[PDB]
Every structure is written in C-alpha cells, then in structure tokens.
Design a protein around this ligand. Structure first.
Ligand SMILES: [K+]
Ligand SMILES: [K+]
Ligand SMILES: [K+]
Ligand SMILES: [K+]
Ligand SMILES: [K+]
Ligand SMILES: [K+]
Ligand SMILES: [Mg+2]
Ligand SMILES: [Mg+2]
Ligand SMILES: [Mg+2]
Ligand SMILES: [Mg+2]
Lengths: 126, 124, 193, 100, 208
RNA sequence: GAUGAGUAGGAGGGCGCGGCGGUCGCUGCAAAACCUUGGGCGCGAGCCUGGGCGGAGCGGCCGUCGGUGCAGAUCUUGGU
RNA sequence: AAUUGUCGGGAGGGAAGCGGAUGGGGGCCGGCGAUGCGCCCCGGUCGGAUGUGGAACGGUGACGAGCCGGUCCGCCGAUCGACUCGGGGCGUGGACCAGCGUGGAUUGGGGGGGCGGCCAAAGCCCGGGCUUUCGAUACGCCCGUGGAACGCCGUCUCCUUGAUUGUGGUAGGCAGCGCGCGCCUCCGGCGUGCUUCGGCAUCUGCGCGCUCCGGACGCUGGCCUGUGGGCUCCCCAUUCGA
C-alpha cells in the first residue's frame, strides 16, 4: 500500500514533559502535573528549569496522529473488524489488539494480506 | 506587545446553535441556516436567531393578544417563534393563518374551528 | 498627471525661493500639511492620557507608523505624547515606498495586502480613488478625502531600525530620537522600511 | 428565490510581492511606471552619450544681465549671512570682547 | 517576415519604444487601410478532441491531488566570464583535485568539457562542474582543436574496460592541444604540476 | 483576517477509576494484574502495541450513576 | 515499591540530581527502505452482440398502464476481450541522503551611472584690473554668460553577491509585451492626430506565443540486509542555563 500522506511529519518536540522533581522523589511519578505552588519556579517559568507543555507545541493538523510509516492506527480485534479498512488502506493501518490469540492473529493477518491492509504488529505471537 | 484588550478578542457570548436536543428543532435550524445563507432575508435571519433562544426567551402568546394584533391583517400569516395558548377571555375567533413552534390543544381546536390553519415553520 | 504635478511643484518652490532672494526679501515655505509618526517606546508602564492618545493615533505597538494631517487639534494631541514618538515631514519617495511595500488596506475591519487596485477601489471608489497612485496622491496632497483614505490604511508595521537608534529617552534636539525631527524623518523611514 | 450559487469565494490569499523589486507587480499596480522607467533610462543614456562625445551644447537658461543681477543678489545675501554684530551694547565687556 | 526585432529591450521586460511608436512600426494602420478600415477577424483555433481512452482497470478509493501549475521554466546554466575557450582551470575537488586543465567548451547540460591534456597530467576528456573549478588568467589557443562530435552523450553510461575508440579520440584531440601548448614556454611544466597552498598563502588574496 | 502573561477566582472541552441499562467483542492456540535501556501516538491528562511472567477472566462504544484521581495534613496503618 | 547482595557497563579534585544542544558508546527498528507499471510477440485458461427465448427483479410513474433497465441461463452468428496466468522484447519507474542549475519570498552586503539644490556651492585654474605684507614676501577684492575637477544633501536608475525558506495543489487568470493578419533597400524606414520638436495609452482589434506575471521546479550522484540509515530508548562527556 502506498500511503496517501505527502507532507513531511514535523515534530515540534520529541522529548517527554516529565513532572518536576519526579527524579528526586520516588513517590512522585513522571506523568505530567502542572505545579500550583505559589513560589514554584517551574510554574513561574524561570529559565533553565523544567518546561511546561502548552498548546503552542501542537502538531500540524495534516500530519497529526500519523505513524512514521505514513498511515494512521486502527485497532482491530478480529477479522470482521478488519474489513472496515477495505476502502481506507491508503490512510489507515491496522494494529491487532494485544489480547488477541495467535490462532485469530493468523486469520487476521491472512485477511489483511488479501485486503492489502498494513498490519503494524503482524509478527506478534509467531 | 500590542495595546489591545484581551488581545483583540471578543468577550461577548451569544447563542450560535440551539441548546436543545430536539431533532425536529435541529432540522428546522438546518432549514433556516440554508435559507439565511442563500437568501439574505432579514426575516429569515431573525427566525434563525430566535430558533436558538432558551425557553424564557421564547415566551408564549395568548390567543386574545394574537387576535388583537392580527386585527386588520387577517390576510397575512402571523408568525411567532414560540407557543400559542388559548384565552377563555376571547369570545370571537376570526379565520387566521398562524405559524408557531407549538399550539396548545384548546388553541389549535379553536383556530381550526374558526376556519384558520395552524402551520409549522417548514410549511411557512 | 500626478508625476507631472509633483515635478511642477518642486520647480515652482525652487523658483519662488530664487525670486525671493533676487528681490532681496524672504519666502516663507508653506507649513507641512502632513506628518508621519512612529512609536519609539514600548507599552510598559503607560500613563492614562498618553495611552489614550496613542490609541487615538492608532499606534498600539512599538515602531508602528501612521500618517497624520497637520491640525491644531492633532498637533496639540501629538504634543502630549512627544516623548513616546518621533515624527517629521515624509517625502514623496517615503510615502510611495511605505504604501507600496507595507501598505495594507482595511476592508470590513480586516487587514488585506494591496496586491491589486481592486482592493483600493472596493473601499474608496465613491471618492474617486481607484488605484495605488490615486491613494498616494491623496495622502501626499491631503486631498478632500484624506481622512477616509488614511483610515483605510492599516497602521504600518515597520521593522526595527536598520542602523539602530541614538537615544530614545531624549528629544531629537538634544541628540535623542523623540520629537519632531522635521525633514530628517525620511532617512529614518529608509532605515525602518 | 435563492441567489445564484457561488463556487469561487474560497480563493487562496495571493502572496504579497514588493512592487519595488519585481517589475510585473509594479506595472500591475501602476502601468505608468513602465513609461517612467523607459523615459528615465533613455534620458540617462542620452546624457551619458552627450558627456562621452564631448559635443554637449552651451545652454544658458538666464541671460547675461539677469545672471549678473543674480550674482550680485547672492553676494549681498552671503555678505549679510556672515555679518557680525557690533557688540556695543555690552559696555562693561567692551575691552574683553575686543571691540576697542 | 520581419528579419529584425521591432522593439529592442532596454532592460529585462521593458521595450525601448512606446505603444504609439510600436503601432506605427507594426503597420496596424496599413492593415486597417488594406482591409477597409477594419482589422481582419481570425477564427479561434479548433481544439483537438481528446482520444478515446480505454476504460480504467481499477478505480482508486481516494481522489489524488493534481499539483497546481508552475509557470516558471528553468533557463540554461550561465558560464562565468572568467572561463573562455582555452582557459586553464584548477580543479578543487574529486580525484583530480589540484590538477590544471584546459577548458574546451560548455555542454548543453551546463557542465564544462576539459582536457589535461591526458599525456601531460593524466586528465582525460572529462566533465567538471563549474562550481568546483577556478578560472585562471592563462589562455591557450584552441582554434585547431575539434570537439564538435563530443557532447553530453559522449560520457553517458550504458548500464570497467575503456574502449580503444575513446583513447584514439582523446589522442586526436590532444595532439593539437599539445601543439598549441608547446608554443608558450614553461606551459608544459605548469600543466603537469598541481596547484597547492603553501604557508602564508591566502586564497582570498591570490589573483589566479 | 487579527491575536497569545497570569496568583485568588470563574467557565469550557477532554483524560482516568468502579457499577447499572444497552450494544460490539476478546480469552487455556492464555484473561486480569505485574515486569521490561522493545516501539509508537497525543501539547497533556493518558493511550496503543512487542517481549516476559502469570493461570482465569476481561475490554471497546452510547447513555446513566458514584464512598471516582494525592507529595505533603508533627496526616492513618503497614513495611524499609 | 521502599530497601539489600551478586555479576556486567559507566562516572567521581569539598554534594548529587535537573533544563537545552551535540557527540562517544550501547540497545532497538526491515511498513528501517521499492522492484512495480505501460506497450508488443508466443503459449495456457475463463468469458464474449445492438439477435432470439426462459427465470426472477428493478428505476420512474400512482407499491396502475406506458417507457426505460440490469443479473442469470440456452441457442445462430460474430472472432473479440480479460487473467495478482507462464516465457521473451522496448520504454519507464521507488524510499532516504547529498551536490548542482534556474527561479519566487524575506534579508544583509559590494561596485557604478544620470539629474537637481547650495553664494544658481565654496574653493582651484585661465586671462583683465585694483590692493601691497613680519609666521615678511602674504592676506587679498571684482570683471568674464571664461575651464576642468570636487563636497554635502535629495532624487531616478544599472549591475553583482552571501544567508533562511517553498507554506498551497481541479485555475493558463490578472498585468505587461512579442510574431502573423501591409510594404520596403530590415543596427531601420513608410499612415492619421496632439506635442515641450525629445516624444505621446491618438488610433492599441483578432489568432498564436513569451515574462520579474493568482506560494519550487529540474538534473545528477550515493545507498538499499551492509563496518548501512534512523531513533523519541539507555549510560556517559562536553559548552550554556540551573
Ligand atoms: K519517581
Ligand atoms: K496558558
Ligand atoms: K460491555
Ligand atoms: K509495554
Ligand atoms: K460508564
Ligand atoms: K533561494
Ligand atoms: Mg505588528
Ligand atoms: Mg523613564
Ligand atoms: Mg462504592
Ligand atoms: Mg526494588
């Protein structure tokens, strides 16, 4: 399948937005939280400190959510759900759900090969 | 920097669509959106704007008041974006062409008995 | 016709000066009817009156430029904000270059580039201004419809001066940048456009 | 009653090109610029040719008598331009100022 | 048919003559007089009906985007004024970097055709990009050198062993080139020696 | 076309947890949970997925509900 | 999970950790990165009308008539078409990364030319007069429509260069201009009007074309299972911040 996307994928930032002091205290997880402290230097945006996410980092709408291969992801749990992409094989790729058994994975892979649908994880459980 | 209030953005809020989930009201809104876009009629624009409004902003009109306002204009189609209720204080009901969002059962019966008709906005 | 008129006016001024010298007297040049005003200070820590006057002049950003017809009311308004602006008497070359390179028209409160004469026509055809040269002539001569044409022009968004400034905290007379710098505004415009 | 349908309203914004650099945009905005440029170039070429040939004419815009009058007026104007005051109003500083 | 341009260009896109003089020169008045005071009307050229293309074997599910028309057409590559036939060039890159070679002509593609000569410095008939070359002030007569039959196609790959025909052609071309070179004293040694930068040699000060 | 600072505070749109009414599915050819310098998506809350372990269940979507989201409280219990 | 032992990698001149940018090393990735397409010849399979019958059915109309229509099956002619069927020819073709060319946008430089203003420059020089000095052999003044060369300011123009970048994808539009529709002796000339006597959008229409003209196109090379390419992953080092 030849992807329909033509514009190059541009990422404004590829680093994660790690929570401040999650490196310091084990009990503080990495998942982003906006500081609310009155004196927080991160909240005040002191230079040389942890950066806060904002809408300015937003990805271009034309290339948003596109995988590096040039397609968009769609999770399929069985071969029946695979036929939904029959008319969208140039824009959408299928990823088999993590809980599908190998037996059903083989059938899904065969059907997709018949339908010219890209599978991102076709080698799983083989 | 630029010396503007709120970066030049508006701070006034107005309705741009009905808050109701009535599918028929949504279809009427689509109809009058098309009419407003492709005709540029002031009447259509007013109807479209009123279709968005809340219940308290679409007060009902009594049958007696409707008769009083239609006096001398019975040949014209009277249009109200709202409900039309009956009035037991009104004795003589003339033949009226009335379009409204809803009619009470008594008001509809009296209007139809008098020889008039009750219309919806699609019919309008 | 406009180009011929400009040349004729220049020649007439030179001839009038020469004739005045020959007669042994003095010729007083007509006072400037047009000014170009550039904001040179930022928007921080603004006094109420200064801020209000700067909005009325349509100077909301540092280094924004606008034309202003010379008037007692307008001159007295500009006197109050002198420290925040610098202004002078624009050249024909200055006006033409400003309108050609950074001229944007206001249509339905939107900023549209003057890439065609139709944009000018749509707004100023009622007054007979239907082309860029007509607009330039109206601005430079301060014609009967100067107000409409000037308001039609979006405030000019000028870049930082190419060679920098001397000192914006002092009047041009003391060696600074603020105030009336009369015919020398043209070189600043060259460096700012 | 509907007005005619419109299909050419969503045109992409035309890119702004400076008329001071590219000729076609300048001519589109002001056709007379073509004639102005042509006349300017022709005049410059004619002046250069006249200078190189050294066959230039001897043109006198002003006649002899009026030229002399102009020169006299200019000389008088310069004389008054460089003139100084007598500094006689400062009696207490007459010696210091060099008047006497 | 007019054998000379009516309106010479003063600069790019501006004619020397105005619309009135162009009207006089083009003879529109003469045409109007001959036709009876009215210009002759010419019918629009009839378009060719499109060929009956056979029906497609497949129908795409998506409408592919057709690119917008680009009105700009590339122009031929320019040749620097410092490079003229017979000029000695210094190669600044590639396996022949530093070698001094003679310039013969510019090909259609814009590349420069040069020769060592091959005997003097081992550089055969070759194409060198103008961007990787320095044109010096040394010029050698090349009037007796015939390279008419050599063009951009002469170096095209047919996809290890050099054909003898190319060797013979190079010898024939280089015979006259060496004959011309021998006229200038010390030119043989100059062409047989490479260019190099020594201590305190500044490229921006050398005149070449 | 213009525009972008935000404590206290207000609001909108979304992310996540556990039930109920429906609907579409997964699972001993290996579910949940947990582990992993495997990989990817989203500005982000989070999400999808490879591999391992585990050995019996679980999830998506539309509504609707709640004892529904922790770094602090000389916070509680347990553990170190 | 906190916490601890062992093995392996790494770092360590009075904390460590952290933000941003590269690099070294490691780890991982083949939808990590293509080999198809078009036109012909040969061979193999499957079907081939607007004709004629049958089965069921549809669009519209009024879940009537009429009109129109597709699917499947059997026959007479027609001898064509298809195949992700095999072999043989010609052409063409992929992802990524570089170089180059020509151009658009934005922008910073370099080299010239024309015109005007000034004491209608000042000065300098050429001749005709007057004046006659101490830093001793000067300062000097005006007469000529006298002659070259500048200065500053303003303005109109030509050429040449480096850097960042191509957003969009149904338009031959807009503006300007060439060739043919007349001729001659073809660096040009020939007609009518207005001119400042240079020239002028005064005649300026059609067809075909060109361009600084409604946002980048073209050519070449390297590489494709490799010690290759990429990386948001991991451990470190360094510059700046903290
Ligand atoms: K942590
Ligand atoms: K914010
Ligand atoms: K369920
Ligand atoms: K995982
Ligand atoms: K729920
Ligand atoms: K470029
Ligand atoms: Mg601005
Ligand atoms: Mg101050
Ligand atoms: Mg509970
Ligand atoms: Mg642990």
């Amino acid at each position: 399948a030849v992807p329909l996307l033509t514009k190059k994928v541009v990422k404004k930032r590829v680093k994660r937005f790690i929570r401040p002091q999650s490196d310091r205290r084990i009990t503080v997880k990495e998942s982003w939280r906006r500081p609310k402290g009155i004196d927080s230097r991160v909240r005040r945006k002191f230079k040389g400190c942890v950066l806060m996410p904002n809408i300015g980092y937003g990805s271009d709408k034309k290339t948003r959510h596109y995988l590096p291969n040039g397609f968009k992801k769609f999770v399929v749990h069985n071969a029946s759900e695979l036929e939904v992409l029959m008319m969208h094989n140039r824009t959408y790729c299928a990823e088999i759900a993590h809980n599908v058994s190998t037996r059903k994975r083989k059938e899904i892979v065969e059907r997709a090969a018949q339908l010219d649908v890209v599978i991102t994880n076709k080698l799983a459980r083989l | 920097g630029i010396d503007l209030k709120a970066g030049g953005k508006s701070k006034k809020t107005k309705r741009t669509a009905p808050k109701s989930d009535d599918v028929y009201l949504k279809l009427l809104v689509k109809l009058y959106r098309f009419l407003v876009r492709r005709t540029g009629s002031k009447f259509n624009a007013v109807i479209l704007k009123r279709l968005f409004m809340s219940k308290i902003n679409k007060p009902p009109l009594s049958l007696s008041r409707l008769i009083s306002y239609a006096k001398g204009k019975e040949d014209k189609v009277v249009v109200i974006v709202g409900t039309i209720t009956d009035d037991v204080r009104a004795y003589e009901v003339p033949a009226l062409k009335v379009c409204a969002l809803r009619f009470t059962k008594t008001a509809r019966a009296r209007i139809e008995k008098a020889g008039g008709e009750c219309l919806t906005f699609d019919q309008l | 016709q406009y180009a011929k008129e400009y040349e004729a006016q220049e020649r007439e001024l030179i001839q009038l000066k020469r004739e005045a010298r020959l007669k042994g007297g003095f010729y007083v040049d007509p006072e400037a009817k047009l000014l170009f005003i550039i904001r040179i200070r930022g928007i921080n820590a603004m006094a109420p009156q200064t801020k209000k006057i700067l909005q009325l002049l349509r100077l909301r950003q540092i280094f924004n430029g606008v034309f202003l017809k010379v008037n007692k009311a307008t001159v007295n308004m500009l006197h109050r904000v002198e420290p925040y602006v610098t202004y002078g008497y624009p050249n024909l070359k200055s006006i033409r270059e400003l309108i050609y390179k950074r001229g944007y028209g206001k249509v339905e409160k939107q900023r549209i580039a003057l890439t065609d004469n139709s944009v000018i026509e749509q707004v100023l055809g009622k007054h007979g201004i239907i082309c860029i040269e007509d607009l330039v002539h109206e601005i430079i001569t301060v014609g009967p419809h100067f107000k409409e044409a000037n308001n039609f022009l979006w405030p000019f968004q000028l870049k930082a001066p190419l060679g920098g400034l001397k000192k914006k905290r002092n009047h041009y007379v003391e060696g600074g940048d603020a105030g009336n710098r009369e015919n020398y505004i043209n070189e600043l415009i060259r460096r700012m456009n | 009653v509907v007005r005619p349908i419109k299909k050419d309203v969503n045109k992409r914004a035309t890119l702004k090109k400076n008329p001071l650099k590219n000729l076609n945009v300048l001519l589109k905005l002001n056709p007379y610029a073509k004639t102005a440029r042509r006349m300017s170039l022709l005049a410059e070429a004619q002046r250069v040719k006249a200078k190189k040939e050294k066959l230039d004419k001897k043109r006198h815009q002003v006649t002899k008598e009026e030229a002399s009058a102009i020169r006299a007026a200019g000389t008088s104007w310069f004389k008054t331009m460089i003139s100084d005051s007598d500094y006689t109003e400062f009696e207490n500083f007459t010696k210091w100022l060099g008047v006497t | 048919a007019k054998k000379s341009p009516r309106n010479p260009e003063l600069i790019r896109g501006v004619g020397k003559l105005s619309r009135s003089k162009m009207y006089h020169k083009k003879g529109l008045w003469a045409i109007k007089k001959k036709n009876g005071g009215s210009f002759p009307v010419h019918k629009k050229a009839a378009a060719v009906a499109p060929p009956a293309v056979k029906p497609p074997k497949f129908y795409p599910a998506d409408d592919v985007a057709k690119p917008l028309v680009n009105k700009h057409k590339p122009k031929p590559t320019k040749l620097r004024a410092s490079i003229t036939p017979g000029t000695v060039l210094i190669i600044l890159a590639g396996r022949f970097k530093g070698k001094r070679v003679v310039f013969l002509k510019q090909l259609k593609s814009g590349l420069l055709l040069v020769s060592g000569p091959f005997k003097l410095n081992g550089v055969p008939l070759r194409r060198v990009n103008q961007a990787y070359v320095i044109g010096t002030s040394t010029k050698v007569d090349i009037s007796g050198v015939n390279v008419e039959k050599i063009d951009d196609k002469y170096f095209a790959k047919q996809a290890n062993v050099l054909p003898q025909g190319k060797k013979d052609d190079q010898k024939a071309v280089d015979e006259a080139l060496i004959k011309a070179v021998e006229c200038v004293p010390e030119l043989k040694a100059y062409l047989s020696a490479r260019f190099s930068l020594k201590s305190c040699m500044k490229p921006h000060e050398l005149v070449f």
